[PDB]
Design a protein around this ligand. Structure first.
Ligand SMILES: [Cl-]
Ligand SMILES: [Cl-]
Ligand SMILES: [Cl-]
Ligand SMILES: [Cl-]
Length: 286
């Protein structure tokens, strides 16, 4: 059920994240800003500095660092006062996503330059993971931090260890993979794809399930904190909720354009969805 609509961005909203305490929402947007919101929907700050569209946003687990990915080829790190701390340069094309390791001391970035780059918390470039043959669209850490998952326009998910050694390539999607997520218990990987499906995989690389129902590209996927519910965002303007057995639970309609990402609150009580209609919408579990 729709709880709140966050209006303020002047262009498409490309991503959304909850602060670790769940009291602050961060939105990324094509208007070159990240915005920080409260639960009532009141805008708190606007983070300016990127020279192009912002494609993703993430909080460090301690809640003290905000990372933003941008088409200007950089990741920028900010404090909770909206002040710029650092700019991570190195990617040769647009940065499409960013994520913090579970211990918060390593940062992974995905780029259209076909690589994932691993960075220390304080900006040092650690590794460049090469293997994808097209743009990398998203990245995620396993909750034990021992594995990294990367989604790519080359239609695969790749699984890496923290040395940057490629462990698995997940093959099955018919078009670009747009996002990837680990289940909280780490046993399940979910992938979203332009082929209109979500696919569920085990860490041994085996296809478990294909979640069908969306009528356009699936742009993102997320696991509830308890691991029992899957949320999918789609260019068909909806968010869909599924169970671990692939059954469609319910469909969240309300956005007037494509939904670009989705996230659960840390406490599992709220779903946030970002849309090309320039808003973030907050939903309850019912
Ligand atoms: Cl726009
Ligand atoms: Cl490419
Ligand atoms: Cl870690
Ligand atoms: Cl939950």
């Amino acid at each position: 059920q729709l709880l709140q609509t966050l209006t303020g961005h002047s262009s498409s909203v490309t991503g959304v994240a909850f602060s670790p305490d769940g009291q602050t929402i961060a939105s990324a947007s094509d208007d070159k800003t990240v915005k920080l919101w409260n639960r009532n929907g009141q805008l708190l700050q606007t983070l300016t500095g990127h020279s192009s569209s912002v494609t993703g946003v993430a909080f460090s687990p301690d809640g003290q660092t905000i990372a933003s990915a941008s088409d200007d080829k950089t990741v920028k790190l900010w404090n909770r006062n909206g002040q710029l701390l650092q700019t991570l340069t190195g990617h040769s094309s647009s940065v499409t996503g960013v994520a913090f390791s579970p211990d918060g001391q390593t940062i992974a970035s995905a780029s259209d330059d076909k690589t994932v780059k691993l960075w220390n918390r304080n900006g040092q470039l650690l590794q460049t993971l090469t293997g994808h043959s097209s743009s990398v669209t998203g990245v995620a850490f396993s909750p034990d931090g021992q594995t990294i998952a990367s989604a790519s326009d080359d239609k695969t998910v790749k699984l890496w260890n923290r040395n940057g050694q490629l462990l698995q390539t997940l093959t099955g999607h018919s078009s670009s993979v747009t996002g990837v997520a680990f289940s909280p218990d780490g046993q399940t990987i979910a992938s979203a794809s332009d082929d209109k499906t979500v696919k569920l995989w085990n860490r041994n690389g085996q296809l478990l399930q294909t979640l069908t129902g969306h009528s356009s590209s699936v742009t993102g996927v997320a696991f509830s904190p308890d691991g029992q519910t899957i949320a999918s965002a789609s260019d068909d303007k909806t968010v869909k909720l599924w169970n671990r057995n692939g059954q469609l639970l319910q469909t969240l309609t309300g956005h007037s354009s494509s939904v670009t990402g989705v996230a659960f609150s840390p406490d599992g009580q709220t779903i946030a969805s970002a849309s090309d209609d320039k808003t973030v919408k907050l939903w309850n579990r019912n």
